[PDB]
Design a protein around this ligand. Sequence first.
Ligand SMILES: Nc1ncnc2c1ncn2[C@@H]1O[C@H](COP(=O)(O)OP(=O)(O)CP(=O)(O)O)[C@@H](O)[C@H]1O
Ligand SMILES: [Mg+2]
Ligand code: NA
Length: 393
Amino acid sequence: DQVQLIKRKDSGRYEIVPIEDPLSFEKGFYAVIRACQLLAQKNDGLILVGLAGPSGAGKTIFTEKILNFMPSIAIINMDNYNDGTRVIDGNFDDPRLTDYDTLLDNIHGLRDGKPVQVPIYDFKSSSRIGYRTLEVPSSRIVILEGIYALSEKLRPLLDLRVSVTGGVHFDLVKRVLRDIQRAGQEPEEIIHQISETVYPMYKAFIEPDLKTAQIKILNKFNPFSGFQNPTYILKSSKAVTPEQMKAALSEDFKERTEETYDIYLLPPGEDPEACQSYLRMRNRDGKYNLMFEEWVTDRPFIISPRITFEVSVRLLGGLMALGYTIATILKRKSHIFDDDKVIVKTDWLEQLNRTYVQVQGKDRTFVKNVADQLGLEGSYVPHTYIEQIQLER
Ligand SMILES: Nc1ncnc2c1ncn2[C@@H]1O[C@H](COP(=O)(O)OP(=O)(O)CP(=O)(O)O)[C@@H](O)[C@H]1O
Ligand SMILES: [Mg+2]
Ligand code: NA
């Protein structure tokens, strides 16, 4: 865990000695920070670090913890370099999406001290909407975060190669194992076959790059962290119009609309319309998200950690190949007001032909009072949408 430097023979710049042992999330967080402090005291110019890993392993929450610890660093999200015209698919996992010409040019400019125009990618329209000016930050630390941040085209220009594995990406594999395990099967052999089925590109394209990491962070998933800081939801059948929300709520609430499509998946086996733990595939603005449906009902609230990570549609085919079945499809159209801390929205679901109001957030007192501000008392429905269609048979 001791970070030490060694002069890389190809240049005069020093480099971190590879830590062969995988590291904890909290310990890897401190190993990365101290490695940057040492690399910035022994090498001049830009300190570029590649942060690679699968979707869901925790590299996003890793970055936003480094940013809150050090606001003087800049984070570059590698998916902003995507070019939808390169592939005919919409799979974000596809390594053929990144425009390496713009990427490599951006890092050569930042190495020469120049500010560069880094692209901004809108997944809803699947196009590059514009650019943002990124100067070399004060810390001179730039984090390139992406699934292929340790690709062969980027390793010569990286000063530190960090990989993040595990998280909810691996927890889904253990969850599927809990659902489909048969007696006599060696668990490590089934785990391997689950990963090949549900993540058909991890072993081939993603993992080989992660082995070349100098700090290998293994993020062990915590099932109890979600319910420590969960999402509190109040659902109402009242007809609070979006015009009434705009006026009642503060001007800090930003207004937006969206259409989502939820696919509810049941595990294989005979759940007699009960003991049913759903997996939810959500489609929203060009992204597919897998969600775990772990719910507690404290009237009038409904509470859930809302554990979710981005997945390819291929994951749906893999789950169904492993016995998971589609219970129902829920198509909705939503009108959202977002305080960035509290969300007040109205959802219209086609299958119910009804309109519901939803106040959600991580601060339970903030959710209750905002719902009281809209006069929602006496109209609460403490049930999930999938539970409402079940009740209205
Ligand atoms: N050790 C852990 N304990 C609890 N939750 C964890 C976890 N590691 C990862 N997660 C969960 O993983 C989810 C998504 O991971 P995160 O966004 O942090 O990294 P990521 O970039 O790989 C996913 P995405 O690509 O969709 O952004 C979050 O809901 C987070 O709570
Ligand atoms: Mg539901
Ligand atoms: Na069995």
